A paper describes a structure:
Importantly, KCNQ1 and other Kv7 members are regulated both by membrane voltage and the signaling lipid phosphatidylinositol 4,5-bisphosphate (PIP2). The voltage sensors close the channel at hyperpolarizing membrane voltages, while PIP2 is required for the channel to open. The human KCNQ1 channel was purified as a complex with the structurally obligate subunit calmodulin in the presence of Ca2+ and reconstituted into liposomes composed of 90: 5: 5 1-palmitoyl-2-oleoyl-sn-glycero-3-phosphocholine (POPC) to 1-palmitoyl-2- oleoyl-sn-glycero-3-phosphoglycerol (POPG) to cholesterol [wt: wt: wt] with 300 mM KCl.
Compared to the up map, the down map shows a dramatic change in the bottom half of S4, near the intracellular surface. The lengthening occurs while the S4–S5 linker helix on the C-terminal side of W248, whose side chain density is apparent even at the lower resolution of the down map, remains unchanged in its position. The density in the newly formed extended loop suggests that as S4 moves downward, it forms a broken helix ~30° relative to the bilayer normal, and an extended loop. We built two tentative polyalanine models into the continuous main chain density, one invoking a three helical turn displacement of S4 and the other invoking a two helical turn displacement. One and four helical turn models are incompatible with the observed density. The position of S4 in the down conformation sterically occludes the PIP2-binding site altogether. Thus, while the voltage sensor is in the down conformation, PIP2 cannot bind to the channel and open the pore. At hyperpolarized membrane voltages (i.e., at the resting potential of a cell, corresponding to our polarized vesicles), the voltage sensor is in the down conformation, which prevents PIP2 from binding because the site is occluded.
Author numbering:
A (entry chain B), D (entry chain D), G (entry chain F), H (entry chain H): 6 to 149
B (entry chain A), C (entry chain C), E (entry chain E), F (entry chain G): 104 to 396, 506 to 568
The structure:
């Protein structure tokens, strides 16, 4: 895990770009200004109270390592994605219609791009059956 | 197509009023089968009912087999129960296991005289009515006996502590009363204290407020110690019932506090979109990398930004499933106040630039 | 005129202190009639009381008939009980039906010797005191036994589940104890386990903590299984009492949370005005179409605007009947914050116009 | 119901007047500015959170059809109007005085016009008895 | 001077630790007097204890008389108990009445042999320990048995309803079982159903889960109806205990919600000042009329303004005694928001004047 | 070094799953020792079990001694249990005292025949399983039986009041029934009312819903007074169980209200820093006096300023340990509103300076 | 009571001074500006929600008559003033010291004038005993 | 205690510096401006609601004497400092590591000076054992 801790340390230093060893809301907002994602101050404070665990409101190397150390295939995450996908299926039997997914992904959320929505359709399709099942899509989600 | 879904809702997941009426009729026929099974146990109608009810019992078991067959056939609508593998997965469900056990117990032996096992076999059909509530069987974390039995699970540690204290008090008090009244024999020439099993039995009787009427010392010391034991230990014994009732009323109050069901759709959609953003972070050749726009060496930066966006979406979704609360009010006030402060600061600096 | 209203309040809807005193006297005379009816059942005073109390019982039934007559005559004040149709509607009320049943039961047979049915007829008069609380009879959704019995209705599903689990445990335990102790006969030469009816009876006794004192196995296995049954099932049996008590305390806490009675007047008035707006949307020739002012082809637009205004008024009224709550605080903060944001935005654009 | 869905669809399009298929607070406020009812931003957000059911804050054709599909003679509405009219009658016996209705309708609410208040009096009158009964008025309310 | 206050706190209103120790010793000596009185009732020590305990009982009654005398003498510190009229007012207090009754009962007869009334006279001294809690006796709205018994008073209507339903069920069930089992005689040749008094007694036994062991029908119909009665009525019978426990936990939760004791001082002072303002409104010649300043004919205007200020002070004080609550949060947010709106409006009009 | 900490966590403070498994095995071996001790009390296996179980009992006591030795040796990791003084301090702990008492009771006499005291000695080992929960023993304010027994302590005054009222009612009712039924003798030629000890015993039986089946008057007056006593006093007797259950559900609801564990770190650090500031206020020669910077005669001013800063830090820490609450919301809104008012005032005065 | 209702009606008309029959916050604030008591908008809304009972937020003649019709010697008021005076007496035995009343009335409240505080001392004195009893003062309070 | 009450009275007068006998937020803020600690208005209101006990919001001589009269060696304070130090020790056995104390005292709190942090290390050291025990440090805390 030496390469892992080294790469997260250098990423933290790159985001800091100041040498004080901490990530601030101003630095992060400058990062998005450089890359162009139009951040919001509410989103900034929301990620601040989320990632920070020491209660001091700043970002530290041990905190960043601890938050990055979590795994993605947790059974809690599996059940959470199960119940998240359940509400989008009106029938609730695991068979979700094509048109509902299409219009929801288009008009609701952050207005995801049509090409990547079509990518979602083509990879999350059970042999193009239309009434696709999200179980296999979630399984390939959790298989990385 | 839709007929499979309709019959699946008719069988397992009730809706409307016709399916509710059908489930009501199922409950009443379960009551009828249990009641004639229990009345068949009487000695006066042991033979007449057995001879007469042969046709009714065989047609009932045939109906149960046919309903199980149609339920498993209609299970194909559910994505978890598709194909032979899906049928096997449906078989592993506890409700299906119980139903299969009941059917095989019914058909263990054919063309044989009835015995006490026939009543036991029909007694297993009593729990079938409860399977309607547990027909969902989505998971095992909390379902029916566990979903509303979570009240016990929420209070499990301290309930165990209370029952442990009660058991210790019971056994200790039995030991004291035995040692004190080894020589105490009440009226009718019966030795009340002859076995520590009897002592523990009377301890259970006293803690349960039973009062059989056979084993009570007439000594004043015994009366006083029994009174102290009653005024000390009965409250702890009766604690769990009020504990669970109060916790259930707590969650009932929480029910009206619950947030609206339709407000979680944007949060779930954002969570799914961020999950895919994390997935496509693994693929530098994905077309999503061109949405921001060149940029070549910031692939890791984009990946970690999408990962932290997914973390934020996870936190937002976890806050959404929580009902409206003091924490929600506090965070809403905090975000509003910080927005106000930012706006005031920008207005102040703008005015300073304007007039400075 | 007002005399009919005053006598109606004197009879059915009490107010002040004189009517409370009259209702108190009615309750005490009901107690007196029940008590001499129950003392008339004794064998020593069966004949003397019957002979003496003839005049008192006939004057009491005459008084009941006269009070029913005056109540139905004074019912004309209520809009629901006007005329012959209103009197018939008042008759269909459960309280009126019960009173008429009591009167006809009293006067079934005349000039006849008293029997046990006379005590039964007077026993029906016991529920008359409870009719004072149910004298409103506004609806059937919740009233008296249902209004405060809604605590059971609120908990109905899980109360049914708990009693079902208790019944299953009782019958199963009876079956186990019967099968185990078929050959077990205790002292005094009595077969404890001779009928499954007796087994179910003792199961009920154990779950109710009765402890008669006749049927208990002396086997150690029986003692252990009985102890396990007591420590497992008694809590579920005693659950409903604490459940209803905790829910009632919940609603008592909710009582102080309730919003002021006089604050719903503007909401109700707006609801009525919007209801009429919807009604007059059906009539293009109404004079209300000229209030806005020409406009000719926007009749459907005005109709749907009035309909959505009525929907908004319905939502406001439904929020009003709800007590002050976390949701109310959250929505109040949200509306205040959005008003602040709108005002800040308009100030900012005005300043930009001023100096730009 | 083809004519019904067609007329609600064309009404929705008329209110949209932009082609994006959604009704916004700005569009609705412009509508009231054109017709002259002096709307309030609080009222606008209050109707937004009411009619919208998808949780996205906008108005869609399926949502509009679903909200318009409800009936007016629901027993819940009957009982609600019963209890709403009960509080306005101090006696509570269904006989409401003339003067109380007059002054309440005049000075309380949105200051309803005198001519239409008199219209209310003349149609909601039990043969001009003064102490009118609101049962018949509610019945003709629910009879459309 | 201060010595009277110190001895009054020593006697009636405890403080510190020495007075707590004295009250503890008083409780233990009360326990001692009750215990030797109850042990004097035994036949073996009826005479020996009576002869020996004469000196102890007479010195105890002398001590009680002296403590009553010193308590009434020290009552002069309290403003309600000053002078002969104050002493008479203190005598009318229930605790003083009980103490005087106990003393006169002790000294009814002198130099006489003891009887059962002596135990009864000493039994009245048991309640003396409870008088320490009720030593305040500030009012009669809620005190000791009423202050913490208000839990019953808060639930009085529905507790009465539940007990009424239970009583109706008990008497009705007794009638049904009597009518059904008039001819039913159990073993040992005893007629179980011989009197409706016995029927009501067994109904009470069943509803109280007593289970004596003498009167139970062996009929299957009787067993079934008894089981139904148990599963229907026992919960309502046990309701009041859980009801009062849940309400008490409610008020315990309310205790931590209570507002700080020292925050009501400004509200009380403002209330007193406004009360005097109303009083001096009755006196046009008071010097307070010159505080505002001429003004001559606005005396009624000033009077009604002071009266409405007193009404506002009353409302503020009534809000103060209420604990922090959702209504308090809502009104605080409302006043803050309206202040913000007023400030924004004044800023906007000022800017419009500045640049317009 | 770390091995001592690991073995200390293995022994006293469990963590992970292996130590949980070890504690589970300890609980089961405690169950085994208690169960064979209690089965050794039977007369059929009194000698065979005693002869056979000698080796098992001696190896068990050797294991207990070795585990006590290793626990005391590993206690050196804790700062409170370092050195000989630390070992003595660990010995004074109640759990260590109980364990030492158990060991010395086991080894009182060697190479002797077993008696009833051997069962008593092994009975003391039953409480050893509860010592795992009380293994912390941080203080005596609240721990195990006191930590979760604080529910009784929170309700102690009114629980004492309720039990006192119940005791008074019991003794008074016993006196009344004795005086009334001195001459009442029931069937079988037994004098029910022969001793006030018997009267008090039956009062306890009635209040505990025991129902032995020996002493019940058959008089109608006795039946009525018993029914009144049951309908009046049983609720108060059963009060404590529901009281404690409702209070426990209260604190369970409070558990989810509790503030996050990691948010108190800045408050604790500020408290420690202010404590040292107060300490260095006692030392004018400390280097902290130069942090502010000359200033020479303001040493007392700096000291009292640091003291009031420490008071503020204490208040902040005391607010932190409290969960999120209505008071927290109110104070947060108050501070936000006053900040807004201050900012508005400064903006207004700045604008007045700018344009005035 | 004809003179009473007449005098309250004319007082209401005098405060209205506009002819619409209602008292508004602006009118009341203008009244205090004329007389000089420096009102607060919070106090104005606080008296608005207090005196008004119809829920419409304005003041009417029937509401004013109903609020003025209440008596001053209510037993609830007696007990309320009892418990209000109890907290100011540390001993709680009805004997309140002179100095505590003096300093509280001076520095706490609305800073009542010294001359009228001395008037309070001289009339609420039990023969100048210093440790005065407030029972007689409250009795003469409730005797009008 | 005559010297004690005299010195606290003269300190109160020195802080007042106005003669009205009360300490105000403006006066206290002017004091910090003179000495240079950069106070916050939130901190000012927080100390106001803390020290003041009469509920009038100002500071008086009796209140100041009462608040200064409290002792420092209260058992409640002992237990509070026990539980405060417990959370900083992850092991919870009274042995707290050197590095954790170092970095916490440096980066968390009010950024305490390095020299005084080193002073804390040198006096709160059990013979320089590194894994120091805070029991003796708290004991010398409470020994004044």
């Amino acid at each position: 895990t030496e390469e892992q801790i080294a790469e997260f340390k250098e990423a933290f230093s790159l985001f800091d770009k100041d040498g004080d060893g901490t990530i601030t809301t101003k630095e992060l907002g400058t990062v998005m200004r450089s890359l162009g994602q139009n951040p919001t101050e509410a989103e900034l404070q929301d990620m601040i109270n989320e990632v920070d665990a020491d209660g001091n409101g700043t970002i530290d190397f041990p905190e960043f390592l601890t938050m990055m150390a979590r795994k993605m295939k947790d059974t809690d995450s599996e059940e959470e994605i199960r119940e998240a996908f359940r509400v989008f299926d009106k029938d609730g039997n695991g068979y979700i219609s094509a048109a509902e997914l299409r219009h929801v992904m288009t008009n609701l959320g952050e207005k995801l791009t049509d090409e990547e929505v079509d990518e979602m359709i083509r990879e999350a399709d059970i042999d193009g059956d239309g009434q696709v099942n999200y179980e296999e899509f979630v399984q390939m989600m959790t298989a990385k | 197509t839709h007929v499979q879904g309709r019959v699946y809702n008719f069988l397992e997941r009730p809706t409307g009023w016709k399916c509710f009426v059908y489930h009501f009729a199922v409950f009443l026929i379960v009551l009828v089968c249990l009641i004639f099974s229990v009345l068949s146990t009487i000695e006066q109608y042991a033979a007449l009912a057995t001879g007469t009810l042969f046709w009714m019992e065989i047609v009932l078991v045939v109906f149960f087999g046919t309903e199980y067959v149609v339920r498993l056939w209609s299970a194909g609508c559910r994505s978890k129960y598709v194909g032979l593998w899906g049928r096997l997965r449906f078989a592993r469900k506890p409700i299906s296991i119980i139903d299969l056990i009941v059917v095989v117990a019914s058909m263990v032996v054919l063309c044989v005289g009835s015995k006490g096992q026939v009543f036991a076999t029909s007694a297993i059909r009593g729990i079938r009515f409860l399977q309607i509530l547990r027909m969902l069987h989505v998971d095992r974390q909390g379902g029916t006996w566990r979903l509303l039995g979570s009240v016990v699970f929420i209070h499990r540690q301290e309930l165990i502590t209370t029952l442990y204290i009660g058991f210790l008090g019971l056994i200790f008090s039995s030991y004291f009363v035995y040692l004190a009244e080894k020589d105490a024999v009440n009226e009718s020439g019966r030795v009340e204290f002859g076995s520590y099993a009897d002592a523990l039995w009377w301890g259970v009787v006293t803690v349960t407020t039973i009062g059989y009427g056979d084993k009570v010392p007439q000594t004043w010391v015994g009366k006083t110690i029994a009174s102290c034991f009653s005024v000390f230990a009965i409250s702890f014994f009766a604690l769990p019932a009020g504990i669970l009732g109060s916790g259930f009323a707590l969650k009932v109050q929480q029910k009206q506090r619950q947030k609206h069901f339709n407000r979680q759709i944007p949060a779930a959609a954002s969570l799914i979109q961020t999950a895919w953003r994390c997935y496509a972070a693994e693929n530098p050749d994905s077309s999503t990398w061109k949405i921001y726009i060149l940029r070549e060496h910031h692939r890791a930066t984009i990946k970690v930004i999408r990962r932290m966006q997914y973390f934020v979406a996870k936190k937002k979704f976890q806050q959404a499933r929580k009902p409206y609360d003091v924490r929600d009010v506090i965070e809403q006030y905090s975000q509003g106040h910080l927005n106000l402060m930012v706006r005031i600061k920008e207005l102040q600096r703008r005015l300073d630039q304007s007039i400075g």
